[PDB]
Design a protein around this ligand. Structure first.
Ligand SMILES: *[C@@H]1O[C@H](CO)[C@@H](O[C@@H]2O[C@H](CO)[C@@H](O)[C@H](O)[C@H]2NC(C)=O)[C@H](O)[C@H]1NC(C)=O
Ligand SMILES: *[C@@H]1O[C@H](CO)[C@@H](O[C@@H]2O[C@H](CO)[C@@H](O)[C@H](O)[C@H]2NC(C)=O)[C@H](O)[C@H]1NC(C)=O
Ligand SMILES: *[C@@H]1O[C@H](CO)[C@@H](O[C@@H]2O[C@H](CO)[C@@H](O)[C@H](O)[C@H]2NC(C)=O)[C@H](O)[C@H]1NC(C)=O
Ligand SMILES: *[C@@H]1O[C@H](CO)[C@@H](O[C@@H]2O[C@H](CO)[C@@H](O)[C@H](O)[C@H]2NC(C)=O)[C@H](O)[C@H]1NC(C)=O
Ligand SMILES: *[C@@H]1O[C@H](CO)[C@@H](O)[C@H](O)[C@H]1NC(C)=O
Ligand SMILES: *[C@@H]1O[C@H](CO)[C@@H](O)[C@H](O)[C@H]1NC(C)=O
Ligand SMILES: *[C@@H]1O[C@H](CO)[C@@H](O)[C@H](O)[C@H]1NC(C)=O
Ligand SMILES: *[C@@H]1O[C@H](CO)[C@@H](O)[C@H](O)[C@H]1NC(C)=O
Ligand SMILES: *[C@@H]1O[C@H](CO)[C@@H](O)[C@H](O)[C@H]1NC(C)=O
Ligand SMILES: *[C@@H]1O[C@H](CO)[C@@H](O)[C@H](O)[C@H]1NC(C)=O
Ligand SMILES: *[C@@H]1O[C@H](CO)[C@@H](O)[C@H](O)[C@H]1NC(C)=O
Ligand SMILES: *[C@@H]1O[C@H](CO)[C@@H](O)[C@H](O)[C@H]1NC(C)=O
Lengths: 196, 692, 692, 195
């Protein structure tokens, strides 16, 4: 079998939502990886992409997230903004690679989402104060729960039980943009993704 | 089984639903402030009416709960703030009367006007009036305009203000407080325990001691200003006397900065002017904001969320909806921060943007405390936090080090003196005036002096502390102190003094950590983290703790002092010590109309006995009319001139009941000094017992 | 070989070239009046400057030609009109002074303002003040506002008017005329056709005889109006006295129409109201003009040039170029005509359109005469021609006969009376006022009345002729007569009387041809030609002939008369004879402040002689203050009130220097005293030799 | 020969200007006359049908640029300038007046720039200016300098001591024009014969 992610090109990407996919012993071509999309920008944690073309080791970690161009400046962890502790964790692990993309129109299978949405304040209410929860590696926004209801208005907020959530809705104009994360796990094993 | 957790649950209950409703109300207010439309008025009305209705229902349902059973101070503060009745103990008719009179006072102040006899069809409103006051350079015209405004506004404000103070005192008395002065004094300390003995009344002696300590520097500066002022207007300033009130260059005298042009040591040395670089580079409105963000982040404090850059009002709307440019730091809650201001390319705009950003970044740090505690500890910290950074950012050394102001500038030992003088002409000038006005308002409020002594007390005070003398005598019917703005809007007027002190208190305390070498005015807040850590430790407390605890946290002292202030001005003090080393001070007796009047001795009523009577007013009436007739006939006697002297051409002054008078006469329409002593003396001698 | 054909050549060189500049200048004025722009303003400037250049060069080159050698009256008229020096004989300094003072007077009149002590922050200009006067029905308020405006405007117009009259008299004397009155009289003057004798002096006795004849009808109408007025304001009108000035409805009394509402005999019978027909059919602006054209042509006059109908201003432009709606009949010459007005659907609009059509018809009917004669014979015909047609078209019978006003209306013997009363309240009301004002100005200019008696004569006259008495005494410093409009703009004011006579003078004679049967008010100018022929004969003459000949053509009399006027009102006279058949007239003595005053005549000076002196307008001040003090103490002793009586609270009255006069006291801030005789008498008796 | 006026469809019609057209013994068909043009015809109490028979002295065909609305004033019922200061409304043996709005089918006809009718042509004098009036069979005797042309509104020019002033009317849309047919009685050599 082949390590392919063909069904990824299906439609709307995950908005707080997250996914995990893994493969087995296989063979993957670099030509298709190159043909995936043109060069917009890629940043790797002191690992040359070329060196990654060889070596079958534990696993890869591919995920695509809705994002925007300018906010990639704040993507780099250098501040305590709400994106890292109150939204998708910027998990740090074995050297990884971050890629910014602007998908062209010819991939008609992809469906443009209505509007972007990233959380602002999800917390466990208390008596004296707010008692903020903070995202941690390998947690993926533990708040979840009532956040599945959705957002409809500016600074829309709702609380259930004793968890309260509120987020921000960003209207989308023009072509959309995508962010790709490729986190790597070393070591050769059955799960390992092999090159060719 | 109740203890006080019932309070805990009720607290959580209003916490649930207060924030959202506040959010809609505030966003409606912003929507109006951005776009001006009629429907927005209805929107704000339908929001604020229900918002106040929720206030009233929650207050009335929260009143019944007892207070003495509360032990934890944290919840006790919230309960005490919440459990307040105030004006609710007043019956409706007087409440509506108070509202109506306040509105009437506001309206009457808003529509002033003073018109000259020469051209009675041309005259101004407060705006052009202030412009003329700021630009004009004529002694006569300036004195005229000041007198006209004071007379016109005062004559229509006596009974209204009298009834206002009466009703306010009655309300304060009925609210369990001794006086309205106590009610205002029922704030700004309102705490102290287990390390802090201090109560409300101590503030009086605190401010008294502070002013007594600060006096000498102001005395020296006053000496220098008096020495310099005689250049413009000769034969008007006594060497040891006070100064005319209208010559302070401003409408009232709250700020002296406009005198800088006249007290410049010399014009040989040009000042700093680097507008050319930015003007030719044409920095965008966002460039200055980004640079300020970089500066603030350079000290370690967190930067603003990305969402801020989207919902903002950085630039001019360029739309039919007209807006005002007054900078504001709108804090809407729920991490919704917005700045409203129109941006241009000037240094003043730069410092104002820095001040507003300081405001908002201070506000952000404490968002997670609560709702009711979303406020500063006192009335001074909130502006002080911005003011300290504004003072720091203006230093030339930093501006040189950040990229602008190239190294082609060698500072000397006089330019910094000019900068210090410019700062001092505003930082210290307003302190005596603020102190005097606040003291007078207090003593009027509690009722120590009767109503009939208001104006006779006021000018005595102005002679004593500040060092200003009235241009022309004023009778009792006037109401001078009400012509100000803050007097007519019942706004507390104590924050300025303490804010000004705490500013330099914090400046010195923080700079202590930086380990500076030279004078404090050269301190910097450049790359560092421990200072940022201390600042965050200060800010994050919010209202949950006594402010004295905060000062101990940084200032490490339980009270304020002027020692840092005088230390900051030490070079200025030494520079000034070499200019007025012979004489300084004043006498509360001299005045412009002192060498011109006549004694007009008074005979005793008892000496006459028969056909004698007490004045009961109505009699200086006759004296004035008779002397006016005498002067009219005097000019016809030899001068052969047709001046139609009037009744109100005699100035009563310095009366002691049945003990003395004093007077002098002025021309019908050019009242500066006219009709000297000798002429009136001859005229009064000429006449006979037709007067007395 | 010169004779006077040289004058013929000069007049040819003038007429052949004087045109083709007026057209362009007037087109520019039209463009400005229709389009409001600065470019149009500079166009008007650059046109009128050279237009006046041509005028003045023509004048300066035409002066040298002799006059006595001219025999033909036609050319002599043009030469006399062209040849004149006028103000050119004055020095530049005096000319500029005159221009400056005229501009100052216009400006000061245009920017008046008055407002109450109660709410001083709001004040009105004349535009809304006139509306308040028209609508307000309060004795107190109306009297107050009239007094305030009079005082404010008069106090600033005395010296300027004195200088203006002095300079005008001087320049008129320097122009070979005895007085400015003669110069104004030089326009009605005309020579004789060997059987006509009309000098300026004869005009005074002619108008005097006319007024004497017309008096009785006005006396009867005045009786009825006085009888009716007492309904509204009881206890204010003497049965045999005059009327208050401020109660005449209008600002000055120049019209009485606004009293119709109060003098309506009864409201049972509705008046004519046929707005519905054209309001529901919505007559367009073009159809009313077409119907008016058809009416005018029905009598035989030529219809308007077809080229006109395109270039016009019939409708509202509906654009940003704002225009004013004053109806004007512009005669641009060269068969170029334009009517400027915004058209609505109302009867007043209908009659105004007919008036303008008459104006333009009369102007167009004459074009063959030379340029210099292209005007009316006098100042009255040009509007009389329009007014006669306007009067004729208003008849209800014709309106019924032309399609509107169906036959479903049976007139009675009272509706016509109401129409006649409505007409009379305007046609006759203004004659006494106009006569009085013109006489006063004439006598002031010629110089029989010295300046010091300017105001003492005016109120005597108002008591004598018109029948109005002042509400409050007025001293000499006032300048009442200059508060009007025409007085402040140096516009001759006599035309109105002659025109008012001439309308009916023409009406009777012309209707004589039509062979009417009933009262003249039922006459018509319906389909006929001979009347049109007579009108053409009258109009085509132009200015080439003396006007007396014009009257002889149709009036067949050398002088005017009131007999047609009184005949037109005969039914009205007989109707009124049954209402005031017992008493009518007035006495020039009574006044509102007559039963509430006390003489003060003690011959203090002449009785002894020592220690007293002649009245020098100053001791009046002592008396004023003394009596004010007496009233003050009288109120304070028992009434226990605080009324700060002023100096300007005692009204001085008629004077003779013979130690006799009257007065009364007035409240400080009501302008309408009660203060019965008893109180002031007791107060003055209480006092002692402190006064006298 | 055939009494044909083919060269009439040539270009701009006369503006004060006039012309004379006459023919001789011939034949003329009513079919072409009807096909000439479709708007309003008014004859001086003479039926157009009766004119289709009989050969007699002559016709009077002339075409003048004009406007429809002013045709109301065309009828002589007033002393407007059109008659005494412009083209005479000559009255003779019963004639016929016709209004027309020429279409664009025959492009040979040239649309004039602007219309022009006189307003004041007079003989200047000392007192007045001798408002002479037009007379039948005269065709605006003023002429002379009027040939110079008109450029501006109320344009005026004088030569010697003759003064002229006219009006210029801009043309919008399709042009409009009128015919005049004043026929002369009697059979003779120049008589126009029908067929
Ligand atoms: C509000 O947020 C501040 C953020 O500084 C919280 O401060 C924390 O305080 C606790 C002890 O109470 C420390 O252990 C943490 O390290 C502090 N966090 C910092 C400095 O980031 C503060 O506690 C919060 N308040 C509430 C009521 O939750
Ligand atoms: C009021 O009187 C004062 C005093 O005479 C006038 O002030 C003088 O103005 C002249 C103008 O040339 C100066 O030269 C004098 O030095 C001034 N005298 C003083 C004592 O300052 C003033 O002009 C008068 N004001 C009016 C409006 O007439
Ligand atoms: C201007 O022209 C008119 C005609 O348009 C002249 O009217 C004629 O005047 C004479 C005078 O003798 C009469 O005989 C005629 O009957 C008049 N004609 C008409 C048609 O009414 C008028 O006189 C001329 N004016 C001047 C000053 O010459
Ligand atoms: C000035 O005084 C007169 C005195 O009559 C006042 O007019 C009367 O006012 C009362 C109410 O105060 C009315 O009831 C009377 O009808 C008024 N007219 C009379 C009695 O003739 C007048 O109001 C006073 N002016 C002001 C401004 O108060
Ligand atoms: C406050 O006013 C309320 C309402 O009248 C009253 O019940 C209460 O006792 C007052 N006192 C306090 C301390 O709130
Ligand atoms: C503060 O100390 C003074 C002086 O001993 C004492 O009278 C007062 O009660 C104390 N107040 C507090 C709040 O401790
Ligand atoms: C002060 O002087 C400066 C020039 O040095 C001038 O531009 C300014 O208008 C003056 N006035 C004030 C109030 O600064
Ligand atoms: C902090 O250090 C950097 C080092 O590059 C320097 O450029 C910058 O100016 C410093 N900042 C301050 C505020 O001194
Ligand atoms: C007018 O002024 C001129 C020029 O000075 C002079 O010759 C002539 O006599 C004056 N009089 C008249 C009546 O024109
Ligand atoms: C008018 O008559 C008087 C008196 O006879 C005479 O002197 C005068 O010349 C006459 N005037 C005219 C213009 O005929
Ligand atoms: C007169 O009365 C009528 C009603 O009859 C009213 O409309 C009008 O305003 C009143 N005033 C005048 C000045 O006509
Ligand atoms: C004059 O009579 C004619 C003919 O009957 C008629 O049409 C016309 O309307 C009448 N004119 C007037 C003004 O009544």
């Amino acid at each position: 079998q082949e390590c392919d992610f063909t069904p990824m090109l299906t439609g709307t990407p995950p908005p707080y939502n997250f996914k995990r996919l893994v493969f087995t012993n296989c063979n993957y071509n670099l030509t298709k990886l190159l043909s995936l999309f043109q060069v917009s920008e890629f940043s790797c944690h002191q690992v040359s992409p070329s060196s990654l073309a060889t070596g079958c080791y534990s696993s890869l970690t591919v995920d695509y997230f809705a994002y925007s161009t300018d906010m990639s400046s704040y993507l780099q962890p250098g501040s305590a903004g709400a994106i890292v502790q109150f939204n998708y964790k910027q998990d740090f692990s074995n050297p990884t690679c971050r890629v910014l993309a602007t998908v062209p129109q010819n991939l008609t299978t992809i469906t443009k989402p209505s509007n972007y949405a990233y959380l602002t304040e999800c917390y466990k209410t208390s008596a004296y104060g707010k008692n903020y929860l903070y995202n941690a590696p390998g947690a993926y926004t533990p708040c979840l729960s009532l956040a599945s209801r959705g957002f409809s208005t500016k600074y829309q907020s709702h609380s259930d039980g004793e968890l309260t959530t509120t987020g921000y809705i960003y209207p989308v104009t023009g072509n959309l943009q995508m962010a790709f994360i490729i986190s790597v796990q070393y070591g050769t094993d059955t799960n390992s993704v092999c090159p060719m | 089984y109740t203890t006080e957790e019932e309070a805990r649950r009720f607290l959580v209950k209003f916490n649930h639903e207060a924030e959202n409703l506040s959010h809609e109300s505030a966003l409606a207010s912003w929507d109006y402030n951005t776009n001006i439309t009629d429907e927005n008025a209805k929107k704000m009305n339908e929001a604020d009416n229900k918002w106040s209705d929720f206030y009233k229902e929650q207050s009335k349902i929260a009143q019944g709960f007892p207070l003495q059973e509360i032990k934890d101070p944290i919840i006790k503060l919230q309960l005490q703030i919440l459990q307040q009745n105030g004006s609710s103990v007043l019956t409706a008719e007087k409440r509506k009367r108070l509202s109506t009179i306040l509105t009437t006072m506001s309206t009457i102040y808003s529509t002033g006007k003073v018109c000259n006899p020469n051209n009675p069809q041309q005259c101004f409103t407060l705006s052009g009036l202030e412009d003329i006051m700021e630009k004009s350079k004529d002694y006569h015209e300036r004195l005229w305009v000041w007198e006209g405004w004071r007379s016109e506004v005062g004559k229509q404000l006596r009974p209204l203000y009298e009834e206002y103070v009466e009703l306010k005192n009655e309300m304060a008395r009925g609210n369990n407080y001794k006086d309205y002065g106590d009610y205002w004094r029922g704030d700004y300390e309102t705490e102290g325990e287990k390390g802090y003995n201090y109560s409300r009344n101590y503030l009086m002696e605190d401010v008294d001691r502070i002013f007594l300590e600060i006096k000498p520097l102001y005395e020296q500066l006053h000496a220098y200003v008096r020495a310099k002022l005689m250049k413009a207007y000769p034969s008007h300033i006594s060497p040891t006397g006070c100064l005319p009130a209208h010559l302070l260059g401003d409408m009232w005298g709250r700020f002296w900065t406009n005198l800088y042009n006249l007290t410049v040591p010399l014009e040989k040395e040009p000042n700093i002017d680097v507008t050319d670089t930015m003007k030719k580079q044409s920095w965008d409105a966002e460039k200055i904001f980004k640079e300020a963000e970089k500066f603030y982040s350079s000290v370690g404090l967190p930067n603003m969320t990305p969402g801020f850059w989207r919902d903002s009002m950085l630039t001019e709307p360029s739309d039919g909806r007209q807006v005002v440019c007054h900078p504001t730091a709108w804090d809407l809650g729920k991490n919704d921060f917005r700045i409203k201001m129109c941006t241009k390319v000037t240094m003043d705009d730069f410092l104002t943007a820095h001040h507003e950003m300081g405001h908002i970044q201070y506000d952000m740090a404490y968002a997670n405390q609560s709702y009711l505690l979303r406020n500063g500890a006192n009335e001074g910290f909130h502006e002080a936090v911005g003011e300290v950074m504004s003072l720091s950012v203006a230093t030339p050394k930093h501006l040189k080090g950040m990229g602008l102001l190239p190294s082609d500038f060698s500072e000397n030992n006089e330019t910094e003196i000019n900068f210090l003088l410019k700062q001092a002409l505003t930082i210290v000038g307003t302190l005596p005036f603020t102190y005097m006005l606040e003291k007078w308002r207090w003593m009027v409020f509690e009722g120590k002096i009767p109503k009939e002594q208001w104006m006779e007390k006021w000018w005595e005070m102005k002679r004593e502390i500040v060092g200003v003398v009235e241009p022309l005598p004023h009778d009792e019917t006037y109401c001078d102190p009400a012509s100000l703005f803050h007097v007519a809007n019942d706004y507390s007027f104590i924050r300025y003094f303490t804010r000004t002190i705490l500013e330099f208190q914090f400046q010195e305390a923080l700079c202590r950590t930086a380990k500076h070498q030279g004078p404090l005015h050269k301190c910097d807040i450049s790359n560092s983290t421990e200072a940022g850590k201390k600042l965050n430790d200060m800010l994050k407390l919010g209202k949950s703790t006594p402010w004295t605890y905060a000062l101990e946290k940084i200032a490490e002292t339980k009270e304020m002092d002027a020692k840092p202030l005088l230390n900051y001005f030490n070079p200025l003090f030494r520079w000034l010590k070499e200019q007025n080393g012979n004489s300084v001070g004043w006498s509360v007796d001299s005045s412009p109309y002192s060498n011109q009047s006549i004694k007009v001795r008074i005979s005793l009523k008892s000496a006459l006995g028969e056909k004698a009577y007490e004045w009961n007013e109505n009699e200086m009436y006759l004296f004035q009319s008779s002397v006016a007739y005498a002067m009219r006939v005097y000019f016809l006697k030899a001068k052969n001139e047709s001046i139609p002297f009037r009744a109100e051409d005699v100035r009563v002054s310095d009366e002691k009941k049945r003990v003395s008078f004093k007077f002098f006469v002025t021309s019908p329409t050019n009242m500066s000094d006219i009709i000297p002593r000798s002429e009136v003396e001859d005229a009064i001698r000429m006449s006979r017992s037709r007067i007395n």
